[PDB]
Write a protein that binds this ligand. Structure first.
Ligand SMILES: *[C@@H]1O[C@H](CO)[C@@H](O)[C@H](O)[C@H]1NC(C)=O
Ligand SMILES: *[C@@H]1O[C@H](CO)[C@@H](O)[C@H](O)[C@H]1NC(C)=O
Ligand SMILES: *[C@@H]1O[C@H](CO)[C@@H](O)[C@H](O)[C@H]1NC(C)=O
Ligand SMILES: *[C@@H]1O[C@H](CO)[C@@H](O)[C@H](O)[C@H]1NC(C)=O
Lengths: 29, 476, 475
């Protein structure tokens, strides 16, 4: 029921930006 | 105290002169002219008598076809039973050259349903997922059959648009000009470069037996999905038969001396970190040591893994009618050169530890070390503003100017604007408004405010340092 | 203020006037246009009507053979035996000479692996590995080695290496037809083989209107990797000085300069015998010593040069040979360099006397007290500069031809500050670690090292003003 993701597309920025914003606000707080 | 400092300085000076000898040996006399003549022979020659276009300014696929059966064949085969070819009557062409193609399949791109009446074929951008792996055209030989990366002894390349695999449809050319011309004509007739193609590689090598220096040539042409042609080139000189003359033995001796010096430094570092000062990182003269040691160890490992893997030369030397694979050696040579350059730069920077022999040099070092903190504190804000301008320029001008097309290109363009190396025409014609505003505000706020605040901080720190040393010395 | 300093000032002004006259009398106009027309005639002219290639853009050996039989013979011989006038004013002296330097086959060690495919190796040019044997139809002097002492030659220091004065030479003729036939026969019997490493063409003209010989030397180098590197040298000389009254005036000025130099030498020698022994702790004394030694060197060079005019007399005895004027041109260039350096130093010596009021004194004191800190920081600045230059040499030293040599790396780094470097070539030479070097260098030069010089100057100037004000206001 679990599938290894394929190296399709190029890259996604939504998840990376959200994680970076969360880490930065955590550090500042 | 100073007695051991003398020994440390002597050891560092010996290390420095050994490294300088090694770098002078590795960067020998003028091999610049070798690559100069090769490049100007292959990159600057017009593709034909009538056309004024060359490889550096390719525009379409027909230009590539003209260049292939054209300037390339003229610059490859030189006349002087099926004799070899000497390119400048000095450089020997090893084996045969090879051409290779990377293409995508038809149907890897879903067009909207309401538009599936006027158009029926869409070719995706290059990706290993969507790469074609099927025969096409007159499927006879290796030019119309997919060959795996491991069956081609290939590797990735990291071109400009994307990173290309080591597989594809390849063809090995011949030793004489007539055979190669016939092969290229047969490829062009039974159409080989269709809309599905995405990259083309041409590889060969030469020897130039006068000096002892191989040269590997690789030409890449990229066909993006949006249309157009992007050419690139790569000429690399190598040395794989090192031990010939006395200077080679001298360089080998210097290499083993360098290895012994690195081992000595590693032992000293471990011994001093083990016993005392377990924190050890509040100095900035010990992080430099570990950085230098790590870089030198990586360079030694790369050299060991590179010089011992010369089996391809042995395979080529027993059959000189086949394409020699020299791309891996060129790649590792480039990596070794980069690492060695960084290491020698840091070794030179390390010299600042010993220039303290009078009151004039001590106070300058004290001033620099004291103002480093404030400079970093202000540089954080400076870089935040710099990146704000860079991202604004990337978002606004990024699709029209050819100089803001990527974020790093925006950064480099701004750094060039600081030097006054900018041309205002393109930045203005791209946007009537917000164009002049960006340039004017950037120049004003960068030269009138940010550049002067650094001077303010540095001058205040230097003044206070000099005044407090002067007061302490005059009142003791 | 008193008589001694006034005497020193008067003597210095007289010496400066003498030097100004001497330098003005040797760098007049109409000397630039001479060499300019000569260069336009010989360099910019296409090798033939059907080709756009000239000497400055030679690319192969066939291009060299086209140039030799083409623009060279058009620019040397002009029609009115008869003599040749270049621009109807410039007279071609004697005959031109061509000379090649080559290495010997077998000057290498071909690796054992590839010994079965390549049989010929010719090393790069060196004195220890140069050919000394006849080749081809070994009858004339173009197929026989002639030593340096028998050619009255000397080194050249070309682009790639320093070439010897020997080689295989040929003296051309006075008429175009004979020279063309000679070059045709020299090309039919192959004279430029794979072993050829350098070629020289030499001649001279007179231009009797003004009194100025011109010596022309063209060099073509063939690297071991294939290709052609051209270079040229046009140099005007004066060897018949005493023709007019201005020449006698210049000779009198030269004698006066010699007397002044003797007086300065005897004064400096008389000073350091017992009086202030080891007085080298002053700037105005080291400057005087430098000026004296440079002037003595220039006087010695001039004496050793002007007494060597035997070549001119020999040529005038027989005007059908090759005039050998290369040594005179070399020594003239050296003398010009020395004269320029010494005139620059005697000009900057003027700061010893501009102290007539308090403003000049304050500025001089500030400059004097800035020297130590500026030198101490310049040591660090040049350490960083040399580290960056070495990194750039190791990274771009084979593709960018602005970093192709260490001194070229230094000059390119100095030009980067002025912002006249393309940055397009160093971007494609190395996509990573190329831009990093550029950005880091710009940041550390413009933001950290200029402001440090300015801060040092500011602090020193303020401290000097404060000290001088306290000294003056507390009498
Ligand atoms: C590409 O594939 C489509 C089906 O998606 C087909 O209709 C079209 O003919 C193909 N084009 C070719 C094979 O050139
Ligand atoms: C790849 O290398 C092997 C030897 O390891 C060789 O036999 C083979 O021919 C090479 N591949 C090609 C396509 O030549
Ligand atoms: C050049 O040197 C090689 C070295 O053995 C020799 O075999 C050859 O005959 C020489 N001459 C020529 C024209 O190659
Ligand atoms: C070199 O100088 C001597 C000095 O008289 C002269 O005899 C000789 O001819 C000169 N060499 C040549 C090649 O002319």
């Amino acid at each position: 029921r679990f599938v290894f993701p394929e190296p399709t597309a190029d890259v996604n920025y939504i998840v990376m930006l959200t994680c970076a914003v969360c880490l930065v606000t955590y550090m500042v707080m | 105290y100073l007695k051991s400092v003398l020994r440390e300085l002597v050891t560092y000076l010996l290390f420095l002169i050994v490294l300088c000898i090694l770098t002078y040996g590795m960067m020998s006399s003028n091999v610049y002219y070798y690559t100069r003549m090769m490049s100007q022979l292959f990159l600057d020659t017009p593709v034909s008598k009538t056309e004024k276009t060359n490889f550096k300014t390719l525009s379409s696929m027909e230009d590539f076809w003209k260049f292939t059966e054209g300037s390339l064949l003229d610059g490859l085969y030189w006349k002087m039973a099926d004799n070899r070819s000497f390119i400048f009557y000095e450089n020997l062409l090893l084996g045969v050259p090879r051409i290779r193609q990377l293409r995508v399949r038809n149907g890897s791109c879903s067009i909207p349903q309401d538009l599936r009446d006027e158009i029926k074929e869409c070719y995706d951008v290059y990706s290993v997922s969507s790469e074609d792996r099927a025969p096409f055209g007159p499927r006879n030989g290796t030019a119309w059959i997919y060959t795996s990366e491991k069956d081609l002894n290939g590797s990735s390349h990291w071109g400009i648009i994307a990173t290309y695999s080591g597989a594809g449809y390849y063809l090995d050319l011949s030793r004489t000009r007539e055979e190669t011309a016939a092969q290229v004509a047969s490829l062009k007739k039974n159409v080989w470069l269709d809309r599905g193609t995405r990259a083309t590689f041409i590889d060969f090598s030469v020897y130039n037996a006068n000096i002892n220096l191989f040269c590997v040539v690789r030409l890449l042409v990229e066909f993006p999905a949006t249309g157009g042609v992007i050419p690139s080139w790569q000429f690399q000189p190598l040395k794989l038969i090192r031990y010939v003359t006395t200077f080679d033995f001298f360089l080998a001796a210097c290499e083993i001396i360098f290895c012994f010096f690195i081992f000595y430094y590693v032992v000293e570092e471990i011994l001093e970190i083990r016993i005392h000062k377990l924190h050890y990182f509040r100095s900035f003269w010990n992080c430099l040591d570990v950085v230098i040691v790590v870089l030198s160890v990586v360079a030694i490992g790369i050299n060991i893994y590179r010089t011992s893997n010369v089996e391809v030369l042995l395979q080529f030397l027993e059959d000189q009618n086949t394409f020699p694979n020299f791309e891996h050696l060129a790649y590792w040579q480039i990596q070794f050169n980069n690492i060695a350059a960084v290491t020698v730069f840091f070794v030179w920077i390390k010299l600042f530890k010993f220039i303290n022999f009078n009151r004039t040099m001590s106070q300058l070092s004290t001033t620099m070390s004291r103002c480093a903190k404030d400079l970093f504190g202000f540089a954080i804000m400076f870089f935040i503003i710099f990146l704000a301008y860079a991202q604004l320029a990337y978002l606004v001008f990024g699709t029209q100017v050819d100089d803001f097309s990527t974020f790093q290109e925006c950064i480099f363009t701004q750094f060039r604007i600081i030097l006054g190396d900018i041309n205002f025409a393109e930045i203005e014609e791209a946007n009537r408004v917000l164009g002049p505003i960006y340039f004017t505000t950037f120049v004003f706020f960068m030269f009138f405010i940010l550049l002067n605040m650094f001077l303010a901080i540095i001058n205040d720190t230097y003044s206070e340092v000099k005044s407090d040393l002067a007061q302490q010395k005059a009142e003791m």
